[PDB]
Design an enzyme around this catalytic site. Structure first.
Site, PDB file in Angstrom:
ATOM      1  N   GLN A 105       0.871  -1.206   0.000  1.00 37.70           N
ATOM      2  CA  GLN A 105       0.000   0.000   0.000  1.00 37.70           C
ATOM      3  C   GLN A 105       0.897   1.240   0.000  1.00 37.70           C
ATOM      4  OE1 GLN A 105      -2.792   0.936   3.331  1.00 37.70           O
ATOM      5  NE2 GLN A 105      -4.215   1.616   1.764  1.00 37.70           N
ATOM      6  N   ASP A 108       2.422   1.771  -3.472  1.00 35.31           N
ATOM      7  CA  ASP A 108       1.322   2.215  -4.379  1.00 35.31           C
ATOM      8  C   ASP A 108       1.106   3.733  -4.229  1.00 35.31           C
ATOM      9  OD1 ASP A 108      -1.709   2.903  -4.711  1.00 35.31           O
ATOM     10  OD2 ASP A 108      -1.499   0.964  -5.750  1.00 35.31           O
ATOM     11  N   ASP A 110       3.051   6.075  -3.051  1.00 40.20           N
ATOM     12  CA  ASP A 110       4.243   6.769  -3.622  1.00 40.20           C
ATOM     13  C   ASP A 110       4.057   6.930  -5.137  1.00 40.20           C
ATOM     14  OD1 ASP A 110       6.997   7.512  -4.448  1.00 40.20           O
ATOM     15  OD2 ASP A 110       7.676   6.744  -2.514  1.00 40.20           O
ATOM     16  N   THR A 184       4.070  11.828  -7.895  1.00 40.68           N
ATOM     17  CA  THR A 184       5.266  11.575  -8.752  1.00 40.68           C
ATOM     18  C   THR A 184       5.365  10.080  -9.082  1.00 40.68           C
ATOM     19  OG1 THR A 184       6.866  11.253  -7.007  1.00 40.68           O
ATOM     20  CG2 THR A 184       6.529  13.537  -7.767  1.00 40.68           C
ATOM     21  N   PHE A 186       8.034   8.490  -9.924  1.00 40.33           N
ATOM     22  CA  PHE A 186       9.284   7.955  -9.343  1.00 40.33           C
ATOM     23  C   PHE A 186       9.008   7.396  -7.950  1.00 40.33           C
ATOM     24  CE2 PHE A 186      10.215  11.361 -12.300  1.00 40.33           C
ATOM     25  CZ  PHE A 186      10.863  10.622 -13.267  1.00 40.33           C
ATOM     26  N   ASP A 188      10.140   7.650  -4.715  1.00 43.56           N
ATOM     27  CA  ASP A 188      10.888   8.872  -4.289  1.00 43.56           C
ATOM     28  C   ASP A 188      10.404   9.431  -2.945  1.00 43.56           C
ATOM     29  OD1 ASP A 188       8.476   9.968  -5.054  1.00 43.56           O
ATOM     30  OD2 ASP A 188       9.335  11.432  -6.474  1.00 43.56           O
ATOM     31  N   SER A 190       7.522  10.529  -2.232  1.00 44.17           N
ATOM     32  CA  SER A 190       6.544  11.619  -2.420  1.00 44.17           C
ATOM     33  C   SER A 190       5.416  11.475  -1.399  1.00 44.17           C
ATOM     34  CB  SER A 190       5.998  11.704  -3.816  1.00 44.17           C
ATOM     35  OG  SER A 190       5.544  10.433  -4.276  1.00 44.17           O
ATOM     36  N   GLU A 258      -6.318   6.621   5.872  1.00 43.90           N
ATOM     37  CA  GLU A 258      -7.387   5.721   5.361  1.00 43.90           C
ATOM     38  C   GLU A 258      -7.561   4.505   6.279  1.00 43.90           C
ATOM     39  OE1 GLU A 258      -6.718   2.538   3.771  1.00 43.90           O
ATOM     40  OE2 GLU A 258      -8.772   2.175   3.140  1.00 43.90           O
ATOM     41  N   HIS A 351      -5.736  -5.592  -2.442  1.00 43.11           N
ATOM     42  CA  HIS A 351      -7.044  -5.630  -1.748  1.00 43.11           C
ATOM     43  C   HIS A 351      -7.384  -7.063  -1.327  1.00 43.11           C
ATOM     44  CE1 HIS A 351      -7.896  -1.519  -3.694  1.00 43.11           C
ATOM     45  NE2 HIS A 351      -7.039  -1.449  -2.678  1.00 43.11           N
TER      46      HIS A 351
HETATM   47  C1  HEM Z   1      -6.746  -1.858   4.561  1.00 44.09           C
HETATM   48  C2  HEM Z   1      -6.082  -1.562   3.429  1.00 44.09           C
HETATM   49  C3  HEM Z   1      -6.580  -0.757   2.260  1.00 44.09           C
HETATM   50  C4  HEM Z   1      -7.618   0.110   2.092  1.00 44.09           C
HETATM   51  C5  HEM Z   1      -8.609   0.552   3.169  1.00 44.09           C
HETATM   52  C6  HEM Z   1      -7.625   0.519   0.727  1.00 44.09           C
HETATM   53  C7  HEM Z   1      -8.567   1.399   0.159  1.00 44.09           C
HETATM   54  C8  HEM Z   1      -8.512   1.885  -1.134  1.00 44.09           C
HETATM   55  C9  HEM Z   1      -9.466   2.775  -1.720  1.00 44.09           C
HETATM   56  C10 HEM Z   1     -10.711   3.308  -1.042  1.00 44.09           C
HETATM   57  C11 HEM Z   1      -9.045   3.049  -2.988  1.00 44.09           C
HETATM   58  C12 HEM Z   1      -9.735   3.935  -4.007  1.00 44.09           C
HETATM   59  C13 HEM Z   1     -10.622   3.100  -4.887  1.00 44.09           C
HETATM   60  C14 HEM Z   1     -11.263   3.888  -5.997  1.00 44.09           C
HETATM   61  O1  HEM Z   1     -11.962   4.901  -5.704  1.00 44.09           O
HETATM   62  O2  HEM Z   1     -11.100   3.503  -7.183  1.00 44.09           O
HETATM   63  C15 HEM Z   1      -7.817   2.332  -3.158  1.00 44.09           C
HETATM   64  C16 HEM Z   1      -7.114   2.371  -4.304  1.00 44.09           C
HETATM   65  C17 HEM Z   1      -5.954   1.656  -4.437  1.00 44.09           C
HETATM   66  N1  HEM Z   1      -5.454   0.703  -3.611  1.00 44.09           N
HETATM   67 FE1  HEM Z   1      -6.110   0.170  -1.915  1.00 44.09          FE
HETATM   68  N2  HEM Z   1      -6.616  -0.096   0.076  1.00 44.09           N
HETATM   69  C18 HEM Z   1      -5.943  -0.870   0.924  1.00 44.09           C
HETATM   70  C19 HEM Z   1      -4.808  -1.662   0.710  1.00 44.09           C
HETATM   71  C20 HEM Z   1      -4.060  -1.669  -0.446  1.00 44.09           C
HETATM   72  C21 HEM Z   1      -2.931  -2.480  -0.705  1.00 44.09           C
HETATM   73  C22 HEM Z   1      -2.337  -3.471   0.281  1.00 44.09           C
HETATM   74  C23 HEM Z   1      -2.520  -2.189  -2.006  1.00 44.09           C
HETATM   75  C24 HEM Z   1      -1.350  -2.702  -2.778  1.00 44.09           C
HETATM   76  C25 HEM Z   1      -0.561  -3.670  -2.350  1.00 44.09           C
HETATM   77  C26 HEM Z   1      -3.424  -1.171  -2.474  1.00 44.09           C
HETATM   78  C27 HEM Z   1      -3.371  -0.607  -3.691  1.00 44.09           C
HETATM   79  C28 HEM Z   1      -4.286   0.294  -4.174  1.00 44.09           C
HETATM   80  C29 HEM Z   1      -4.068   1.004  -5.434  1.00 44.09           C
HETATM   81  C30 HEM Z   1      -2.985   0.908  -6.446  1.00 44.09           C
HETATM   82  C31 HEM Z   1      -5.127   1.846  -5.602  1.00 44.09           C
HETATM   83  C32 HEM Z   1      -5.304   2.839  -6.747  1.00 44.09           C
HETATM   84  C33 HEM Z   1      -4.514   4.159  -6.407  1.00 44.09           C
HETATM   85  C34 HEM Z   1      -4.774   5.315  -7.438  1.00 44.09           C
HETATM   86  O3  HEM Z   1      -5.723   6.155  -7.293  1.00 44.09           O
HETATM   87  O4  HEM Z   1      -4.015   5.472  -8.461  1.00 44.09           O
HETATM   88  N3  HEM Z   1      -4.361  -0.914  -1.528  1.00 44.09           N
HETATM   89  N4  HEM Z   1      -7.528   1.588  -2.044  1.00 44.09           N
HETATM   90  O1  LIG Z   2      -4.691   3.793  -2.260  1.00 42.41           O
HETATM   91  N1  LIG Z   2      -4.904   3.123  -1.276  1.00 42.41           N
HETATM   92  O2  LIG Z   2      -5.132   1.873  -1.155  1.00 42.41           O
HETATM   93 CA   LIG Z   3       6.465   9.062  -6.066  1.00 44.94          CA
END
Ligand code: HEM
Ligand SMILES: O=N[O-]
Ligand SMILES: [Ca+2]
Ligand SMILES: *[C@@H]1O[C@H](CO)[C@@H](O[C@@H]2O[C@H](CO)[C@@H](O)[C@H](O)[C@H]2NC(C)=O)[C@H](O)[C@H]1NC(C)=O
Ligand SMILES: *[C@@H]1O[C@H](CO)[C@@H](O)[C@H](O)[C@H]1NC(C)=O
Ligand SMILES: *[C@@H]1O[C@H](CO)[C@@H](O)[C@H](O)[C@H]1NC(C)=O
Ligand SMILES: *[C@@H]1O[C@H](CO)[C@@H](O)[C@H](O)[C@H]1NC(C)=O
Ligand SMILES: [Zn+2]
Length: 595
Positions: A105, A108, A110, A184, A186, A188, A190, A258, A351
């Site tokens: 998380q 991600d 970053d 960013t 990178f 990094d 951020s 979050e 997730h």
């Molecule tokens: C309890 C843990 C976590 C919560 C509560 C959570 C919650 C969220 C929420 C609410 C979103 C936005 C969804 C949307 O509106 O499309 C999100 C996006 C994301 N989550 Fe999770 N997440 C969790 C754990 C993780 C983990 C462990 C990873 C990766 C290993 C991860 C990777 C992502 C990524 C890549 C996004 C998209 C980010 C973007 O906007 O570019 N999350 N997460």
């Molecule tokens: O982007 N948060 O899982």
């Molecule tokens: Ca970054």
């Protein structure tokens, strides 16, 4: 040929080609193309966007518009029929700690954030989406299927707002809608320092010339620092306990609060900065605030890069690590360092690794009090449990001693995220992150499952029997085919996550390819990659080789028993050692003498 100029944010800051330090925005990394991997630009398109009207409307928008001749299934229906499960017994990863989930998380956050749109300042449009479940403009509600329990208790839909897109914030484009990356590209830090100058300065401790980050003054942690509060109202962290009235934290990244282990990870990074900066100052008394901040920020960025590429990625990608991310050959100014639109869905494999409970443990790594284990859904936007329930130390022992959830084709996402997710502006623990992910895939104009299989040189199943062989699961394949009709229409998030894991990894072949390509690009296309000759000295890289999550804990908490390999499943005290036996970060090679 075209106009690759489009850009309203056009930060176009003045690049110092002599700068030994990154910009905050990520501008000036690439000398030939200065905005490459900068924040507040379009996510990269590895494949053309796929929208219902070719331009901007998502598949599922118009009920009479098929995808490849079939109606796309309701996101919430796919979630109930495929992603959900009841029994949490036997779901835990027997060889991944909870920190393996948590670091995913962190990395991600970053790399990418596509924030939801806003049009004016105060509209009815805002509540009208929640209140009336009316589809229009940037309101794209997740409607409940007929048999959905939430229909009985929660109304007709889950409100959902379309992601922001580049150039204008409101008016549409003559070409295809491109979603913004607000951070960013990178790797990094951020998420610790910010990706905008403003936020970046709002966060620092200028008062002292010691290059330290700004801290909580209203509250402290048994000596050690808290992230400052965001004292902006209304506060979602206040709203979940109006009594305790503890605000969300203020980090380099607006998502830091979050959930309580994210807030914890972030706390330790505010900390390790100051441990590093103070160590620099003792070792280089002549150095001013900037030098200590910038140099501190550059050591922290290098720390995240090392933990990510040495410890984290090899146990995500497994047998596929070496194929996509072969040993580093130095900086390649021809590599595109931009995060792709698809990567922001691929990296949501995380997730399925989130378990249903979080624990607070003691020095004997034993239950901490009578409410030691808590359901995850009570911990969204929850800062009061850190401040008024024993700081971050007991949570950090949990990260070490407890396990990640294992992804399972029959137990995909815990009901703590799939039914009880809390979102700001919204008053319920009643959202479905799986459904959101599927809706967002369409919102972002994602190509379907077989477009991505093709992209990665993998087979493209066209029949039920095809899908069964690729997923090695008849029942899952049958449910997907009943919902989607053709594998061509499977949303990338659920398609990629449905594949059996690669040998010694935690993702299937398709995600290994998408994740591996992106990570290879963000290392090789990064002029400030820690190991790029001229970023750090021969002697620093010998001493950065030392760094560890095990040591970051030891050196910024009161924890004295740690695993050597902190991402593997570790059982106390059998797989634990005392901190003294853990290689420390010898800063001697940062020793400056200029007299
Ligand atoms: C309890 C843990 C976590 C919560 C509560 C959570 C919650 C969220 C929420 C609410 C979103 C936005 C969804 C949307 O509106 O499309 C999100 C996006 C994301 N989550 Fe999770 N997440 C969790 C754990 C993780 C983990 C462990 C990873 C990766 C290993 C991860 C990777 C992502 C990524 C890549 C996004 C998209 C980010 C973007 O906007 O570019 N999350 N997460
Ligand atoms: O982007 N948060 O899982
Ligand atoms: Ca970054
Ligand atoms: C910036 O750093 C200074 C120096 O470390 C902080 O000032 C100190 O604050 C704490 C409590 O407020 C005191 O216990 C220290 O003795 C103070 N030292 C000095 C030299 O002033 C200051 O609080 C930090 N500022 C912010 C806004 O976080
Ligand atoms: C609110 O926090 C207080 C401590 O400030 C705690 O005693 C109480 O149980 C909390 N209530 C809820 C519903 O979380
Ligand atoms: C740099 O990157 C481009 C695109 O990936 C590649 O074709 C080129 O050969 C690379 N240079 C080296 C030395 O690998
Ligand atoms: C656990 O994971 C590590 C990598 O972190 C690996 O080397 C080790 O073999 C695994 N242990 C078991 C028992 O499978
Ligand atoms: Zn609500």
């Amino acid at each position: 040929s075209w106009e690759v100029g489009c850009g309203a944010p056009v930060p176009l800051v003045k690049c110092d080609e002599n700068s030994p330090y990154r910009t905050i925005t990520g501008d000036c990394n690439n000398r030939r193309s200065p905005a490459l991997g900068a924040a507040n630009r379009a996510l990269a398109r590895w494949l053309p966007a796929e929208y219902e009207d070719g331009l901007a409307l998502p598949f599922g928008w118009t009920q009479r518009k098929t995808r490849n001749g079939f109606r796309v299934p309701l996101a919430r229906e796919v979630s109930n029929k495929i992603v959900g499960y009841l029994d949490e017994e036997g779901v835990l990863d027997q060889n991944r700690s909870l920190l393996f989930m948590q670091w995913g998380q962190i990395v991600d956050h970053d790399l990418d954030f596509a924030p939801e749109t806003e049009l004016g300042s105060n509209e009815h449009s805002k509540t009208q989406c929640e209140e009336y479940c009316i589809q229009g403009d940037n309101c794209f509600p997740i409607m409940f299927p007929k048999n959905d329990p939430k229909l009985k208790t929660q109304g007709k839909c889950m409100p959902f707002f379309r992601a922001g897109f580049v150039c204008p914030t409101p008016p549409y484009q003559s070409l295809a809608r491109e979603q913004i990356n607000a951070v960013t590209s990178f790797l990094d830090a951020s998420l610790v320092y910010g990706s905008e100058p403003s936020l970046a300065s709002r966060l620092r401790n200028l008062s002292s010339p010691l290059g330290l980050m700004a801290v909580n003054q209203e509250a402290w942690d048994h000596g050690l620092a808290y992230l400052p509060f965001n004292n902006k109202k209304p506060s979602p962290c206040e709203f979940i306990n109006t009594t305790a009235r503890v605000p969300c934290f203020l980090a380099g990244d607006f998502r830091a609060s979050e959930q309580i282990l994210l807030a914890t990870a972030h706390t330790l990074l505010l900390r390790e900065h100051n441990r590093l900066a103070r160590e620099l100052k003792k070792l280089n008394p002549h150095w001013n605030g900037e030098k200590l901040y910038q140099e501190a920020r550059k050591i922290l960025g290098a720390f995240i890069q090392i933990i990510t590429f040495r410890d984290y990625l090899p146990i995500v990608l497994g047998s596929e690590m070496q194929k996509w991310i072969p040993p580093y050959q130095g900086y390649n100014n021809s590599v595109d360092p931009r995060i792709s639109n698809v990567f922001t869905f691929a990296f949501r494999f995380g997730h399925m690794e989130v378990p249903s409970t979080v624990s607070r443990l003691d020095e004997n790594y034993q239950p901490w009090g009578p409410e030691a284990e808590l359901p995850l859904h009570t911990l969204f936007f929850n800062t009061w449990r850190i401040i008024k329930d024993g700081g971050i130390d007991p949570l950090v022992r949990g990260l070490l001693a407890k396990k990640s959830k294992l992804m399972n084709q029959d137990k995909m996402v815990t009901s703590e995220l799939r039914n009880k997710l809390f979102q700001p502006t919204h008053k319920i623990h009643g959202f479905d992150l799986a459904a959101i992910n599927l809706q967002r895939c369409r919102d972002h104009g994602m190509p379907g499952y077989n477009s991505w299989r093709g992209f990665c040189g993998l087979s493209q199943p066209k029949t039920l029997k095809g899908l069964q062989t690729v997923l090695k699961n008849k029942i899952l394949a049958k449910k997907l085919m009943d919902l989607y009709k053709t594998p061509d229409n499977i949303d990338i998030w659920i398609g990629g996550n449905a594949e059996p894991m690669v040998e010694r990894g935690r993702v299937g072949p398709l995600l290994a390819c998408l994740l591996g390509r992106q990570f290879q690009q963000i290392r090789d296309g990064d002029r400030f990659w820690w190991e790029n000759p001229g970023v750090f000295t021969e002697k620093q890289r010998d001493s950065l080789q030392k760094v560890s999550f095990s040591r970051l804990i030891c050196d910024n908490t009161h924890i004295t028993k740690v695993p050597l390999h902190a991402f593997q499943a570790n059982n106390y005290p059998h797989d634990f050692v005392d901190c003294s036996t853990v290689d420390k970060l010898d800063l001697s090679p940062w020793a400056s003498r200029e007299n």
